[model samples]
Target: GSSGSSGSREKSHQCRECGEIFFQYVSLIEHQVLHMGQKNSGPSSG
Candidate 1:
């Protein structure tokens, strides 16, 4: 059995529309807007 204290303090910002998680709040802003222009989103590239 594991016996260690799980103390995590890392906060994250998630994309409300896409359900994506981001380490920083700014990252979520950049990704969230990209979804606006794309008519048919496929996969991650670039």
Candidate 2:
């Protein structure tokens, strides 16, 4: 029998620029763009 492990994931770091918290380091890097006010191609402006 194989059972999935359940655990709580915590954010790795809190962005000082945007105040956005990321669970992964990559996410933190991505969130950094928000601080620059870069216009994302996505629907969201920032």
Candidate 3:
């Protein structure tokens, strides 16, 4: 196991159900939108 970089760097993750790969938190947020029957609305206020 390796924690190669600082936590500030963006990360990529794969979706287990659809095998969809996304880079960065924003991309993951966008991808989730597709599953919710909504258009990718870009970043949201939080």
- Candidate 2 C-alpha error for residue 33, in Å: 2.0
TM-score of each: 0.47, 0.41, 0.44
lDDT of 3 by residue, 1-46 (tens): 7878977986568877678887687777677767766554557735
On residues 1-46, what C-alpha lDDT tens digit does candidate 1 reach at each position?
A: 7765468856668777878888877788788778778556667854
Please give the CA lDDT of all the candidate structures: 0.75, 0.68, 0.72
Among all windows of ten consecutive residues in candidate 3, which has the lowest summed lDDT? 37-46
Q: Which portions of model 3 show Cα errors greater than 4 Å?
A: 1-11, 38-46
For candidate 2, the TM-score is 0.41
By TM-score, who's the top model here? 1
lDDT of 2 by residue, 1-46 (tens): 5755458655359877657666778888776765675544767647
Clashing pairs for model 1 are none
Model 3, TM vs. native = 0.44
lDDT of 1 at 15: 73
Candidate 2 ranges beyond 4 A from true positions:
1-11, 37-46
lDDT of 1 at 21: 85
